């Protein structure tokens, strides 16, 4: 049996940012396991020929540990992180965040996973055996070599490759014994969107029980047939695989654009060869329910538009000359109406420093509304605590954010996680007052 | 006295393409000296994390040694160059040329000079003493670190830095003894255009005697007050510097555009010359090897440079990344090319691989350009020599003559703009010899 997953490291002391990815204590892009409540002390050394900085995607830390892109260190310098892990048990990321340089550093290998473990958060699964992170990325190979050469048009729409990888393996295969499997689905692409489905060889769709998203577990498992996974989103599902052949596929949908491997076309991401009797892992009781959203006291609207050549949020974009520019000043519990233009495309928007409760999807496309599970158009992934939510053209997504006074005087980026859009400047500072 | 110039190597055996530039036999981006007629045998090793290929800018070699961008080698692989040097004595370049990746590799340090020497081509000057290459580039520094982070719009117009370097030195100073100096002006920027003038501290413009351009010497020296130098253009001038302070400046002009930290047409100092004491005088008048007379064209071929929405195009075509061997234009024999730039455009340093070009005529030039011409066909002093990279202004027509020799038929040669943002965007086509 073979299950290719990233290697493990228990805590990280020393990470080198290299052109081929993160070299943490000698291993390349390992999954860092942290216990909730523990102290993290990690030192980043820049081994690149350009600035960089590590962002702990989805972590509840102050902006010095975020780290804000203005703290990017030059080639040869170092940056010391020191913070407490207060995030719920979930699957998080660590990736570069220097402005205008993030996409290529990310695309060329600087990406790793962080797993926060809480009391009984494993649910009886074991990493690399039946707890399998599946980081789905896409690269453009030219002469069998991954290349990142976006055109001006690709810098507006996003850089899409011609082949899809799982944990850096093209046409990945998993040889497993029959049993219960916890798959941590992670979109590690620059811009590519997936509609993930698991089907039998004959075509029967295998149901997936969604148990966790970006910021931890749901209240209870939710059965899904397919789920959209936008860049930097996380979705932990449990599947029951008996002896047979299973395909993790991208099911056909409408990529509302404006390609070698069309985004909304059907193709196989990974193949599962299941043979023999393995272990059954009972799953029903989830360890910690997500907290109830707080009552917002202010409504704030956000407009996502393409202003000529520059993606904008409320007509604003990143100010490269003054990275500390305070685009939006916030305070307390706010309700954000994020509204995407019809003359736009999909935006996986992401907010640093603070998790988000998803409240409502209105004017969603038919393919999305067909997957909702409540009277507010919320997808199964919306029913958990999130930090990266996908917004479709013409769609409005309402979220609730609690800007605590504990982080006042700090800046937190709010940007689209389409790395071409972010590098292009679709990023603003959220200043906590 | 101090004159910071690139180091020398006489011929190059082994060159490594690294993220910080070319490591050739242990030195970083050295000036390679070759004798005209000699055999070059050099091996390129890719030490990057992405494909690349070395282009011998302005060399008359077959497309395997050019090398055509389709021959880019992957990380770890090697490429052997082997050719005879048949180019006239001049100042040439070697820089990356993989499609879509050239601008950043170039910008981040992969650029060097090649000097071809013929009989008496030194004119009595000595490299690093009074024969000084001035490679003028510009970089955007953020926190004292050069970065290449173009926005979508910057990939349309070109990546302009906020500081100008001479041989990789910011606010470069040259401490020289008074005498004759041969300055080899080379534009090593990705997109920035310069109008170069040498002025005294009081403001007096020091005349420059142009002696050579891209493809070798002129018929005779030409005195100039200022000259435009577009990316990858070369202009060798001779100046007489007495004791005093001189400034190599960018003179104000209209950058016909459509970050503004350092406006392209604004005035600023590129290098400072502190001249003190008496050095050597070098008499210069008889220039070796006269440029050949242009051959008579038998076909006229028109080229339109336009911005088709988001894609810069040459005759409405752009580079086909899916088929790098795509034959955009098929040529044969001696052709006269009418390269016409749109009014709704910007400056294009146009460049053709494999074959030199005779400049024949400039019409509809802007006033600032027409004021510098030296003949009744609007030709600038730099047009009066054999070229391989010619600047074309919006609304201007430049007619050139190219002799598509029978020696290279069955081969492909790129024809692209040397604005590296424009080239990366796809402003490049294959010229197929029949
Ligand atoms: Cl609209
Ligand atoms: Cu992220
Ligand atoms: Cu976006
Ligand atoms: Cu971010
Ligand atoms: Cu060149
Ligand atoms: Cu060339
Ligand atoms: Cu151009
Ligand atoms: Cu070229």
Numbering used by the authors:
A (entry chain A): 38 to 295, 303 to 477
B (entry chain B): 38 to 295, 302 to 477
Authors' description from the paper:
Multicopper oxidases (MCOs) are proteins composed of three Greek key β-barrel cupredoxin domains (domains 1, 2, and 3) that come together to form three spectroscopically different Cu sites: type 1 (T1), type 2 (T2) and the binuclear type 3 (T3). MCOs couple the one-electron oxidation of substrates at the T1CU with the four-electron reduction of molecular oxygen to water at the T2/T3 trinuclear copper (TNC). The substrates of MCOs vary from organic compounds to metal ions such as Fe(II), Mn(II), and Cu(I) and the family is generally divided into two classes, metalloxidases and laccases. In this study, we engineered the hyperthermophilic metallo-oxidase Pyrobaculum aerophilum McoP to enhance its activity for aromatics, resembling laccase activity, using directed evolution (DE).
The hit variant 1B5 of the fifth generation contained 12 mutations; to reduce to the smallest subset of mutations, the last round of evolution was performed with DNA-shuffling of genes coding for wild-type and 1B5. A library of variants (~ 4200 clones) was screened for ABTS activity, and variant 3F3, with only six mutations, was selected for further studies. The 3F3 variant selected after DNA shuffling showed a ~ tenfold higher kcat than the 1B5 and a remarkable 2-order of magnitude higher kcat/Km compared to wild-type. The overall average B-factor value of 3F3 (49 Å2) is higher than the wild-type enzyme (32 Å2), and the loop 288–310 in the 3F3 is the region that shows higher flexibility, with B-factor values ranging from 43–69 Å2 (vs. 22–58 Å2). Part of this loop (segment 296EMGHGMQ302) is not even visible in the electron density maps and was modeled with AlphaFold2 applying a local energy minimization using Yasara. The observed increase in flexibility of the loop in the 3F3 variant may be attributed to structural rearrangements resulting from mutations in the loop, such as P292H, as well as mutations close to the T1CU site, like P390T. The increased flexibility of the loop 288–310 in 3F3 caused structural alterations at the entrance of the tunnel: it is more polar than in the wild-type and has a larger diameter access entry (4.0 Å vs. 2.8 Å) due to the shorter distance between H294 and H292 (3 Å vs. 5 Å). In 3F3, W355, which is located at a distance of 3.4 Å from H465, exhibits significantly greater exposure to the solvent than in the wild-type.
